Design a protein around this nucleic acid. Structure first.
Ligand SMILES: *O[C@H]1[C@@H](O)[C@H](n2cnc3c(=O)[nH]c(N)nc32)O[C@@H]1COP(=O)(O)OP(=O)(O)OP(=O)(O)O
Lengths: 922, 336
DNA sequence: GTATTGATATAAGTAAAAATGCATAATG
DNA sequence: CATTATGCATTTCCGACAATATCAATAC
RNA sequence: GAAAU
């Protein structure tokens, strides 16, 4: 039943909506059964497989694999039952001092009550599925890593208990999770038996016997032991052929029924699954601030934007899917498909008496071959899974619930198949709704094809001329995509180019292009979004003119301009005439210039720039022997060019970095009452926090990691508790503040645009910077983008941000050394003498901070008479608070107030001038 | 007729890269008198000897002044030490070559390319009496060089294809405690295991009396080391320096399998052998429990075992029908 | 009296300590 | 304070990423 | 390996 074909065949809108409603009410059961969990389903499937194998005698297939899984479960269940009974018996002891204190007291009391809740059969199924799914992970050739093994089983069990809670101790300790996982994995290793054949060199004949399925071993990587579980070759070869669906169903897939709209920080997305509004991994501060913001209810605009992003219906492009299926079934590696690789081949072993350099070279070659083979298999398996999902959802309507990371950017909930995937995945997706092309539909389709081929810098008229010139081979490629000229493979995005060529041929065949119905998305991508945001923030006319922010007859290109600057610099260096200059004269690549120039204003280092240029110079192979030194030369030159060119982006970056440093080197006045015990140099628990224009709070999670060994049954894994608040990473926060701010601004603009498009009645899909709508709606889409950009950036964002910092961090203290010879220090020394007189010894900054907090409370105290008394008290921070020149004081260690640097001057540039800048976003 | 540098000359050397050198001619002549290299090398006049990382080179100068070999070359790449050696030892029968000993290609080029230093290949029946190697790896960060040299002794590739070549090795006292670890000691490691499997070593000198507590008392009293103070090395802040004598011995086993067995067994050096076999592979516990008849061996810990029982376990692993493929025991975290 | 905390070695060519690509942070 | 060390713009997804065992002092 | 700045 091809629902998409039926919907397109229906000629009347009334019956079209009636059919859509009927499909929606019909697909509820399918969506529920797809979203359902896997534990009971797998248990019943294994039971039925075992019973039918018993009826039929035996098998030697994945059916026998499931029978073996059932046998493992049946043998495991007594062990888990006995363990739970032992835990219950040991928990009923009235009183004891050392009753198996080495083993029972330290562990059974640790993980008794947690284990006694969940059904033993359910835990058995969960651990079996988790260990079977975890295959070839953690860098292990044939097994997986113990550190992930114990956590994954523990985390899955806790998540299972949470599923029992919604059917009716919020979060479990990491140590408890690891202990439970290790215990269950130990029981599974003890039980799992698999038969295997072998030949004894003495006997020189086949031997029949059984061996354990799992083994716990240790591997050495550069002198560090690894906890590794090894999976038997029989299990490896018997699980290899089942992919990721036959053994067990997946969990995250695109839905069919309307996604549940975002209402709270947990209500949205999948119908029967809770998804956090923020991609918070291990950030208690992030989750707390998100919960507070959701309670305050100031992210309704974010909710509207996410609803609009996740309401657009999709379907699988049948023609491109058929072409991809034909190419994949042909078996030879295509441009994107890696192709079918049969098996591993290893070089012959050199003689044991050969040179150690020769042996090292052979070892390196073997390692390289193994890594390449593993990567290629994984890529082929991922492509096969993508094709399987596309075929399963072919002919139906698709919905893509979206989610946000802490920066605010939008990501789909389903990671396997989405519109953010590679070229094949992007080409295999089209909008469910079809809209007439109108007068500008043909023009916009031609523009989309031309800029898909890579000619996006050229004007729209030239793009249309290019498409008109190449319409002949567009039609050719459409008629015979395979076994023909293959013009689409010459493009930058071959699959989307193929889809657009199909659409253009369908338009050309029709007599009247005006009334055609199209489903192909049209990508309208902005140019240099980060530089655009700097231009809007600083109000620099030069930057705005460079980044196509102002209207123009032709679109200027900062990347092209700086590439020409590098050309001039290297032709000046031609006087020196080194080998690097001679090689790189006519081969300076706009791709490396793109990456370096774009990432310079985000705080890239010299090493990072060298690595980026070397990586992007690798595919073209200007220096096949070694490109690193020439890359360093090029980085020096391009850095000189960017430093001479950009002058306001750098100012904004420097102000943000200095602010981040001052925030990361501060501490709360009254909160520091806890005995940190360091005395003079406390710990820092301050993270840069600010709110987006949309209202979403942002908390940078860069904190130190407290990794400690925790004792488990299998081994002492080396994990870190995510609940332990740790001192911040000052360098990480300082280096990451500007990019986080800029991407947050980009996400806010995108969300405002999506909300306004949803209000206007359009279909909107956003791959971060680039925006996708129908070909007919491109003009209104551009108008609404410009309107929303004006609305967002008409306010002084940097000034509001500094005001937010000042409001949030008013009562903060920053420790700064002060010169002993300073006259103001004499008063400070006298005051600390009183702070030493009461203490009776050397004055402590902790006591000084407590005294400072005493005055601040009295200022806000209800008693007016005590407030005057509170204003009478004088401290080191109180004495300096009358002085505004912070740099004047900057020996002795003195507390200083936290004052952020003043914002750079705001250049005069009207932002409304972009209402007619047709080339602003293209 | 060979000059010997003094501490006045040595104080002019700014950089030693962490390498500590002894400068006392009294200590060198005492060490040589204890060693008595003349009995093994019947004719020093025809002796060929190669030195690695000479640095100061007073040891080489005294060795030449005592025995006078036909050819004696020094391998260096350190700029300051090489310049000092060239300035001091120019116009002398000694020879100095500017090649870094760390690089494996250095020896192959030096011997098999332009005939500069050609040794004579001898059978493994007895210690070679025509080749001798002296090194100095007192640098703390170059333990891997010594371990690779031990592996090369095992594999008969780097310089031991010429036969059983005696080796003199200035090398740190902590590594001395590591290598000279009898079974049962708390410093027993795979370094000591390969040391006793491939070679038989004697300790000659040590710069600190306190370090002698760690070593085995019987070995110390049998060796009778030449103890000396810590004022005979110019860098005082460095760790104590010991000396060892390396003599290769004959062995009959498969190096790769023995290496795998030792590495994967004595990770858990304190656990009893009744359970450590599970780390070897799948079913190793049951297979070894069934095969092994000596119950005391199972009770013995891997830190109490020696090369004999290690070879026995390697043989058991060899005739294990279901032994895993030891070739692919690595992690694929590799740059691509 | 004992259990939690911190130090150290493993393997061993991704050397190490000289240099340097460099800005910024941590030293005594 | 001149001297010496540390890491190298951000984020998302995928089998990505990523130490452990033994032994000492000590804290209780 | 893929996506964006
Ligand atoms: O080209 C890659 C790829 O073949 C493989 N690889 C490395 N990391 C990943 C990953 O997270 N996911 C996938 N699918 N493939 C991966 O190794 C090659 C790169 O090797 P590197 O050691 O340089 O890998 P690293 O992760 O350090 O960096 P990057 O090059 O991938 O960014």
């Amino acid at each position: 039943i091809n629902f998409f074909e039926i919907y397109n065949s229906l000629p009347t809108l009334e019956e079209k909506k009636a059919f859509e409603s009927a499909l929606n009410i019909f697909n509820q059961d399918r969506q529920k059964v797809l979203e359902n969990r896997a534990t009971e389903a797998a248990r019943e499937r294994w039971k039925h497989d075992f019973e039918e194998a018993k009826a039929r005698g035996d098998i030697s297939i994945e059916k026998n694999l499931n029978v073996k899984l059932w046998k493992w479960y049946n043998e495991m269940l007594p062990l888990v039952k006995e363990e739970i009974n032992h835990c219950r018996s040991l928990l009923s002891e009235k009183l004891s001092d050392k009753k198996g204190l080495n083993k029972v007291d330290t562990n059974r009391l640790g993980y008794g009550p947690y284990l006694t809740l969940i059904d033993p059969g359910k835990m058995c199924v969960i651990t079996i599925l988790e260990l079977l799914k975890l295959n070839s992970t953690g860098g292990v050739i044939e097994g997986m890593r113990t550190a992930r093994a114990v956590i994954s089983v523990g985390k899955a069990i806790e998540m299972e208990f949470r599923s029992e809670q919604v059917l009716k101790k919020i979060l479990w300790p990491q140590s408890i999770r690891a202990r439970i996982g290790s215990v269950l994995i130990s029981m599974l290793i003890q039980v799992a038996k698999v038969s295997v054949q072998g030949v004894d060199p003495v006997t020189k004949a086949k031997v029949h016997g059984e061996a354990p399925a799992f083994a716990h071993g240790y591997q050495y990587h550069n002198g560090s032991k690894l906890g590794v579980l090894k999976i038997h070759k029989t299990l490896i070869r018997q699980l290899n052929g089942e992919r990721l669906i036959a053994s067990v169903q997946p969990q995250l897939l695109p839905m069919l029924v309307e996604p549940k709209p975002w209402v709270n920080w947990r209500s949205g997305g999948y119908h029967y699954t809770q998804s956090t509004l923020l991609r918070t991994k291990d950030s208690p501060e992030q989750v707390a601030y998100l919960k507070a913001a959701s309670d305050n209810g100031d992210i309704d605009r974010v909710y509207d934007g996410l609803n609009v992003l996740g309401r657009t219906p999709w379907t699988v492009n049948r023609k491109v899917f058929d072409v991809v299926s034909q190419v994949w079934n042909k078996g030879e590696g295509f441009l994107d498909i890696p192709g079918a690789q049969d098996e591993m081949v290893l070089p012959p072993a050199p003689p044991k008496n050969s040179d150690p350099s020769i042996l090292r070279a052979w070892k390196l070659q073997v390692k390289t071959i193994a890594n390449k083979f593993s990567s290629d298999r994984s890529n082929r398996c991922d492509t096969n899974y993508k094709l399987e999902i596309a075929r399963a959802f072919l002919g139906e309507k698709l919905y893509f619930p979206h989610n946000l990371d802490f920066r605010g950017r939008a990501y789909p909930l389903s990671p396997h198949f989405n519109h953010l995937g590679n070229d094949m995945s992007r080409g295999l997706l089209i909008f469910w709704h079809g809209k007439k092309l109108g007068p500008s539909g043909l023009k916009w389709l031609k523009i989309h094809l031309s800029n898909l081929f890579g000619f996006d810098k050229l004007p729209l008229k030239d793009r249309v001329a290019f498409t008109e010139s190449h319409l002949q081979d567009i039609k050719d490629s459409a008629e015979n995509p395979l076994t023909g000229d293959r013009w689409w493979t010459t493009a930058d995005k071959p699959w989307q180019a193929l889809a657009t060529c199909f659409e253009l041929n369908e338009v050309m065949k029709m007599d009247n292009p005006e009334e055609f119905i199209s489903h192909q998305p049209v990508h309208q991508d902005g140019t240099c979004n980060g530089l655009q945001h700097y231009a809007a923030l600083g109000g620099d006319v030069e930057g705005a003119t460079q980044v196509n922010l102002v209207p123009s007859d032709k679109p200027q290109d900062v990347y092209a301009h700086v590439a020409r600057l590098v050309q001039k610099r290297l032709e000046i260096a031609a006087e020196k005439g080194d080998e690097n200059a001679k090689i790189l004269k006519d081969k300076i690549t706009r791709k490396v210039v793109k990456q370096t120039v774009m990432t310079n204003v985000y705080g890239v280092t010299y090493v990072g720039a060298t690595f980026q240029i070397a990586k992007q110079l690798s595919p073209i192979f200007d220096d096949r022997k070694e490109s690193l030194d020439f890359s360093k030369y090029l980085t020096k030159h391009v850095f000189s060019a960017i430093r001479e060119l950009f002058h306001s982006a750098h100012l904004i970056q420097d102000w943000l970095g200095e602010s981040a440093k001052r925030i990361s080197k501060s501490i709360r006045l009254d909160v520091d009452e806890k005995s940190f015990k360091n005395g003079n140099k406390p710990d820092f628990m301050s993270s840069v926090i600010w709110t987006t224009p949309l209202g979403l709070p942002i908390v940078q999670p860069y904190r130190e990691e407290s990794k400690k060994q925790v004792e488990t049954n299998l081994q002492t894994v080396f994990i870190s508790d995510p609940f332990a608040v740790n001192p911040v990473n000052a360098r990480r926060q300082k280096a990451g503040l500007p990019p986080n701010f800029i991407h947050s601004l980009d996400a806010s603009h995108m969300l405002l645009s999506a909300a306004e498009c949803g209000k206007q009645g359009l279909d909107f899909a956003s791959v971060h910077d680039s925006y996708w709508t129908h070909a007919s709606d491109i003009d209104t889409m551009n108008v609404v983008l410009r309107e929303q950009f004006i609305k967002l950036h008409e306010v002084d964002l940097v000034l509001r941000l500094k005001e937010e910092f000042d409001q949030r961090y008013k009562n903060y203290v920053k420790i700064g050394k002060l010169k002993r010879s300073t006259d103001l220090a004499q008063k400070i020394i006298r005051i600390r003498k009183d702070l030493s007189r009461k203490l009776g010894r050397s004055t402590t900054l902790a006591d000084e901070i407590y005294f400072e907090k005493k005055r601040q409370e009295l200022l806000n105290s209800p008693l007016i008479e005590d407030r005057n008394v509170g204003e009478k008290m004088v401290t080191t921070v109180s004495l300096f608070e009358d002085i505004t020149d912070l740099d004047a004081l900057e020996g002795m260690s003195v507390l200083l107030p936290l004052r952020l640097p003043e914002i750079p001057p705001k250049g005069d540039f009207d932002v409304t001038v972009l209402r007619n800048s047709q080339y602003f976003f293209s | 007729s060979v000059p010997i540098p003094g501490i006045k000359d040595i104080s002019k050397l700014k950089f030693f890269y962490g390498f500590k050198y002894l400068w006392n001619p009294t200590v060198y002549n005492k060490i040589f008198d204890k060693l008595d290299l003349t009995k093994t090398y019947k004719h020093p006049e025809e002796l060929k000897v190669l030195d690695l990382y000479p640095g100061v080179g007073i040891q080489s100068a005294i060795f030449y002044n005592k025995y006078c070999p036909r050819q004696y070359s020094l391998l260096e790449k350190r700029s300051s030490l090489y310049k000092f050696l060239n300035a001091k030892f120019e116009g002398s029968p000694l020879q100095i070559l500017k090649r870094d000993p760390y690089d494996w290609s250095t020896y192959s080029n030096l011997i098999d390319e332009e005939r500069i230093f050609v040794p004579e290949v001898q059978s493994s029946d007895h210690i070679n009496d025509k080749f001798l190697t002296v090194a100095n790896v007192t640098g703390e960060g170059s333990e891997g060089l010594i371990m690779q040299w031990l592996s090369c002794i095992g594999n008969k590739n780097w310089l031991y294809r010429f036969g059983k070549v005696k080796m003199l090795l200035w090398m740190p006292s902590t590594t001395a405690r590591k290598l000279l670890a009898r079974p049962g000691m708390h410093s027993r490691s795979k370094c000591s295991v390969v040391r006793e499997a491939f070679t038989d070593t004697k300790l000659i000198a040590i710069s600190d009396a306190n370090e002698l507590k760690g070593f085995d008392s019987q070995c110390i009293e049998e060796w009778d080391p030449i103890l000396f103070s810590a004022a005979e090395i110019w860098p005082t802040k460095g760790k104590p320096i010991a000396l060892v004598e390396m003599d290769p011995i004959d062995f009959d086993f498969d190096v790769d399998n023995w290496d795998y067995v030792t590495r994967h067994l004595m990770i858990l050096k304190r656990t009893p052998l009744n359970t450590v076999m599970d780390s070897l592979g799948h079913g190793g516990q049951q297979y070894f429990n069934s095969r092994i008849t000596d119950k005391d061996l199972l009770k013995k810990c891997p830190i109490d075992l020696t090369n004999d029982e290690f070879i026995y376990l390697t043989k058991l692993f060899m005739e294990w029908p279901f032994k895993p493929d030891i070739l692919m025991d690595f992690v694929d975290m590799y740059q691509t």
